[PDB]
Design a protein around this ligand. Sequence first.
Ligand SMILES: [Zn+2]
Ligand SMILES: [Zn+2]
Lengths: 729, 1151, 95
Amino acid sequence: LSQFKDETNPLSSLRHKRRISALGPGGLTRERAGFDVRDVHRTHYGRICPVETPEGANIGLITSLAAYARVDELGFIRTPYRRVVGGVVTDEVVYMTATEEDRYTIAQANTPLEGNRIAAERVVARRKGEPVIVSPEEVEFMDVSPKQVFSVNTNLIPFLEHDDANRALMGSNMQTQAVPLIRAQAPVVMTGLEERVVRDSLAALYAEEDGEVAKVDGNRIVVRYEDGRLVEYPLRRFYRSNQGTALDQRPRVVVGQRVRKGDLLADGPASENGFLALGQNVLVAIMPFDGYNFEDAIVISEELLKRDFYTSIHIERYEIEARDTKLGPERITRDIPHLSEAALRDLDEEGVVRIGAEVKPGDILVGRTSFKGESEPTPEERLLRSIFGEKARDVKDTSLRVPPGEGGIVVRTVRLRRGDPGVELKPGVREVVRVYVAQKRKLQVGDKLANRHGNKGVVAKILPVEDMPHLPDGTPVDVILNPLGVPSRMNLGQILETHLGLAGYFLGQRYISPIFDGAKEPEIKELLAQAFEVYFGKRKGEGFGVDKREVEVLRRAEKLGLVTPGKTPEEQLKELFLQGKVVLYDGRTGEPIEGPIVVGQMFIMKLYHMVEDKMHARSTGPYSLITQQPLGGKAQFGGQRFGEMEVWALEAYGAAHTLQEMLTLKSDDIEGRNAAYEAIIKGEDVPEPSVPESFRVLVKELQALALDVQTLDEKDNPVDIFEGLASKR
Amino acid sequence: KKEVRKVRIALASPEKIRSWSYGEVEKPETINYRTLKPERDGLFDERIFGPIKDYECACGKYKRQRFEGKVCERCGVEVTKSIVRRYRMGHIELATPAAHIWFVKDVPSKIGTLLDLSATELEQVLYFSKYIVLDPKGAILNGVPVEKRQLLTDEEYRELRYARMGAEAIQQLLKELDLEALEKELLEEMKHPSRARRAKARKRLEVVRAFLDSGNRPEWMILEAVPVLPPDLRPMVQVDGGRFATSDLNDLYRRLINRNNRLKKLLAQGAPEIIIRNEKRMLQEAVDALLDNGRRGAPVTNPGSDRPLRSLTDILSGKQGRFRQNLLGKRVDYSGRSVIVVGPQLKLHQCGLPKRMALELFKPFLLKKMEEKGIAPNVKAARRMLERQRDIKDEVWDALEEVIHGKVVLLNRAPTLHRLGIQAFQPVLVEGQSIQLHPLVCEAFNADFDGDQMAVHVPLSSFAQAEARIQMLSAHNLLSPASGEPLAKPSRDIILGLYYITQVRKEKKGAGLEFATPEEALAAHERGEVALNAPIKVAGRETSVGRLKYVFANPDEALLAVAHGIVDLQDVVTVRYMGKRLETSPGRILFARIVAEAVEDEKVAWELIQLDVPQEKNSLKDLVYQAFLRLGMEKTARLLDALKYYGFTFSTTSGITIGIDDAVIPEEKKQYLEEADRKLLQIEQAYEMGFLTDRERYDQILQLWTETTEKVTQAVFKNFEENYPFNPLYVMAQSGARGNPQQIRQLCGLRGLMQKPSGETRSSFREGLTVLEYFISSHGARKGGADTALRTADSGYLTRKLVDVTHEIVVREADCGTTNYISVPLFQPDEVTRSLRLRKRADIEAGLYGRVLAREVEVLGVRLEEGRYLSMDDVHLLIKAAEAGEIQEVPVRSPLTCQTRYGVCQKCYGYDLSMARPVSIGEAVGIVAAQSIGEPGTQLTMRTFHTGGVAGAADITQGLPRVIELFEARRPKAAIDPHQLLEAKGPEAVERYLVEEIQKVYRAQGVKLHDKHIEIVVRQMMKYVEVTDPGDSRLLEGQVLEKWDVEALNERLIAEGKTPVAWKPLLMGVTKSALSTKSWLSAASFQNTTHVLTEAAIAGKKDELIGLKENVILGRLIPAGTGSDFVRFTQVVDQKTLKAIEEARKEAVEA
Amino acid sequence: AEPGIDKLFGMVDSKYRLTVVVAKRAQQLLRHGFKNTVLEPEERPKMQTLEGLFDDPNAVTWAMKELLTGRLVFGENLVPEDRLQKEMERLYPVE
DNA sequence: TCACTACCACAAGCTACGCGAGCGCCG
RNA sequence: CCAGCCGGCGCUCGCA
DNA sequence: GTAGCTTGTGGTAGTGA
Ligand SMILES: [Zn+2]
Ligand SMILES: [Zn+2]
């Protein structure tokens, strides 16, 4: 039941903190029984978010709870409902138990009201998980707010009302995987909780009571409250999240500043201005390019990387120990026994790497030296030493190196010596060493991003702003989405965001659309009309009117039926601008793209690059003791699984030797893999496969069981698998 | 160095135990803490299992490879690696016998069945309890003469003295049994008495023969010596700080030593019966522990984790058992994986790969290449140079860039459903992380770009490198092994761009449209266009003004105006081609020219290029198909790469983007939602006075919203058809590109009305979908993700069975000469009353495409020779002819009737190899059919019933369930019972029902696969039959049919004495067909892995290795593919070596 | 794609057989030295850092081009099993 | 007659449950 | 040439 | 949990030494 804190981002940490599970002591629920349980039951109202659960084998069982849902005395998640006597509503509320809930007639909050008086006779209400249209007279209790039925996690999506529940989970789940960006900006559109989140979570730091500002260090901020008190508030400089993420608090206030009780002091890891901010709002073009935004493929502007827009600071806590072998305690020293001084530069401090140094895959992070043999010296390695320089330090190199993939800059180091001040030093362990290194994993092409709605995609190309699409006004887009991945998936909620974000750019402002009660289509056209004044009004006064390009498309647009023919292009454009689409020039050819293309400020996010992101490529390496199948982990990547699903595929094809190759020389065949390596090194042709181990070990298992498994030849007679290790004496 | 052609499971003789065994484990002394060395002769002593060190020994007399096969005169140690240890077994001399629980507790207790005692409870009763027996003779009484084989207790046995018991009791029994004697005894009991007692004797008789026949006699069933698994096998490691992990077998292997040793001391100390047994219970129980845990209670490791220590069974059977481990194979050395990202420029022939990865991959190939150049002196040197990323010189990148040459690799997607789930490409090194995949394959491996992760390997052997770039190279795998249909079909992206350009536009027709005749209609109606009255695309039949104003000579001519902004590609113009005055749009012709560009044969291009209509997914499907056919593989390839780029670039500029206003709402809904809401009250006010009831009020409301939803579905698409032919959301759905059909509106109904949690069933997504309206639909999207979840499990599982059975099925042949053909029906009887109808286009295509005629046929006027392979063009011919009324069925060769015992001929199968020409001999069809079947099975789309009244729309969909009940003989929930069907109409009939009764599904899901595959399978279900008139072996028996074609063929033909082998055809489910197969190598793989061998040991089964499953596990080259004896031997020669051997000939003339 | 893949196709009665051929051929080309060819003069395989494919880039790619010509011959049992490995090391030098 | 059971039915017993991937920790 | 990473728990993805 | 494959044995009408 208890797990690592998904501290991707304080929010991620906060949800990982609110989710409910099924599996457990075992007396409660087992794993293979759940069709009726995993169902989103009718009482799950305002108590359980029916969106929060994880997609996969373990679904419905694991699920975080609703907004206000709270446990009373004995685990009964009550949910609030305002009281109402007659046709009169109350500012009073009651947390009702699921049981007591069915007892009454509850109504939605969408319900019109004069402050305390209902407004419609035939108004909606829900009896016991049953939709019933009742009169204002039989009304006994109402929902507090639409937010109460979803999780905090889920309550964060703008136009959730226009998106499908299924892709909503993807939106909700993907939020727990966000990553703290150096530059964090709260969503161009919010629902109104991002403040609350950071507040209720301990992201940002708040002011206790009214007061004034004293010291504003990059490490500490001291204040003098109005009650004559003053405190020094230390700031978490740079700490390693359990997920290996950055944890800092960025002051945003100046010295000597009269502050209000509970005003943002320093921005938490991911708060723009005490507002939850993860990812940034980007200008985006909802159009298809060559193929770079294929099915869920995406296209980025080199312009975004220039202004370190999407950069993630990631911290991996590699770790190594100085074991005490009876062959001789593994020593820690800058002595790397065999080859260069070139690789001993950065390892300044005796054994220690200097902080603030650039580390690439393959470099030694920490030097370690144990002893060569198991217990005896070596006869072939003995004569070789004497030749060049018999006097060579017998200690072996078992030094922590930069695992292939990527390394960054060592920022912090920790070393625990003999005289334990007060630490639980495991037995045999002489001493330990932790190294924290981070890298501006610059949003590269391999990375993936997604909006709060569910659209998921991997960056296909990093176009130079030079030729990527640009507005009639020099300003170029940041990203280009593939429309295709939109009609199929059901979430017009994002289309409304790009549009609304559109206004905000030339209107320079943010907004807050509650869940079901947020903004509306007409209202949006309003602002657009107004934003069109910013875009073109400015363009008109700036000395010029329209381009021959803006008209070619206008011709095509009128023919389209997007614009009512017969209007002055000035008017036509406005009408087309209100449609959420504007004209865009190719930038590569500068020829406009026949047909207006909607665009907008879409708030999108970067997604977790597990060490599963940083690729795994293996040639040769470790194998399993029992099964002689290859594996990795620390340094050696670790092989990939072939699975039968795949076997069969090859089985479909006539890949006989290709299949032979896999089962053997490539995985289990010992003398095959061995001699194989020797073969390719020679540029020769692989010998013929010997018996795989998983097989040999298998027979013996069988033989261990009374079962006797014997190999046979053409004419039913013995053959020998065990090359000669089965015969006695 | 030969090849193992047969595997054999047989019981083990005590001596054979001694045989595999090296020394005897006699004490539970693993390893003593102070010394990480094996304690004593314990379970880890190296004598008993193997050299604790490489080639090295104990004290150190001999230490290298020079003397690998000699032992040290002082302490005995021959050495290879430590493998020897993980190889060698051990044996424990048990005090008093005990027996394998596998045979004792197997449903048909293989021991209680054989020995007639209460097949079940009595076993339990004395085996783990107290009851003694008498050996040969015992002259004195108890009340009745010596019980030659009956049992007595120690009490009326103790009295006597002044015999053996437990498992020591049945030990004697088995020995004194003269199989023969009792064989004669049951043969009689079987046929004479009635079914009651005759029935038992019968099943009871299989076990016996089993022993005798095979020889391997049954006396070994009891245990007195236990084989010890090598050491290395069950781990004994150093976790951390001092922690140690050891395979649980050791916790039980110790539980066992203690008691046996405890017993040797107990029996040698004093013998108080009570406690003697108390421990024999614990003994025999610990026995079962390591063999099988759970079959009887479950032993736990002391307080820390109440987890049943994994037993031998659990190790062999299961989803991740041992067979599970092997049958599927698990970890390559040269592998890798990373995220995917599109490669537009990428040609099918190649694929983009991050250098950095490559680096590690072709490490060896590179290394060698290093020394080859001046970059590195020696190997070790080259490695050190690469040990770090900042040590790399730019020159290295050249060498690597060099070793890869044309060398190619394979790409695997997440779920590997079919052969295309993996393909070979020409890696073109690249910077960064992600991996560039070509897009049209996205459909092959069901994969979109939303985070998709896949794998990759390298054809090391030049032999293995060969096949890859050859038969695995994607470019050569265009068609679908499922449907002769291509699988490189343009996708949602390209196609979108391709449709844009070729669509024709129609605008306004307010004034005259009949230029068809008037010349004043040419002048006047031409000035009206110049004006504002007549548009450029008016609905005039002879030619709208668009054609009149502009006329183009040469092709180029026309395109020059477009760019000049005089004409748009979607305009109806008039242009002349190589020989015709044609009236068509700029886009339609452009498409034509491009066609001619990719491939030079300009004339053969337009032959299949109907540029009448806007290019849709099927028209392109039909063209790609064509191309591949007419022109040839590689040439049809240079094509795909072309369309790709253009449908890509065409998409960019098309300027299509979804807008909120784009999702346009019909003005219509308000009226119809009103005309329907008014009828709801006519039916609700129906409720007040009892014209109806409860059941009927519910059904009529269902039909109201079932007919009204289909009504709003036509309207949105009709409006887009007449008013907005070019809507991003519309044009998207119509093109193969992207969209949904039942789904959009169906989706709307779903959000508006979704069924309740159980199943008992106003807003759009454009307009606010109300609060509750969103929670109601949640129940379904909730059930949908769960249903599909179990569906993937059953699909791979189903398919797992497909392979379990059709693996062995391959094309090793010479036209199976048995010409017993199947007749393919063209007309279907009952869809209403009694009527005759022409089956569907598709279905029929699916039944006859690329097949083999059993006999000649003269239809409409052409002569269809016997044996010819009919192409789709021919398959169409018949249609037109049946339409005529000259033909009703079709004599066709098929596997169901192919002769070839194990395998099928090239004639019984057909056309479609990945290519279109006849299938090449040595093709693993058993698999290809299995995949092409199991890949579609997962998605498991919607199933339900939808019924209307007056408009009258009834929809019919069903789930995998049936598919299951089908492949597995079963008794459907409500359906035609096969067992009865066969009885009624016989084989050729059931055969036919199955197949057709299985096709209905996919037909109902949009999926399109050929019947071949299914046949394959079903024939496999009917490869066994029962008996009725004996010859060699007794009647009632289920066995291999063809194998009977063998014995019968010889009982009449060769050896005289016509002993009619009256048999009875037997039906078996896919499951049960695999379960019981000749080879057990395949059977041991699935099910318990218990019974499988249990049965195959008794009978020293000589598993003739034919088939892949069995031969794969061995890691032996596949009996097929390249291992097909047909081709596995083939020599190549240069004309220079020919005359050479010819001279080895000319020199033979002596003196 | 690959040159005249269709040409080659029709040349065989069975696909999987084709594979066997080339393979055992490029195996020969390597083993007994790489000068064991039959079409090097004028037109021949080629690479581009320089034009050195002429020596030993991809064997199978060569066997392709050769096989695309009517030079070689393939039969179930054309020349006595072991008598072939003896006469192939006698006339081709490369090492 | 005497008598042994013979043969239908229903409860009761084991085996599946896609493919791959990573991350912290547990003895 | 020797080691931590056996297994597993729990968690995320791709394919709707 | 869920369906389902198979065995095994006890419960309710026959029938011949
Ligand atoms: Zn010695
Ligand atoms: Zn046949």
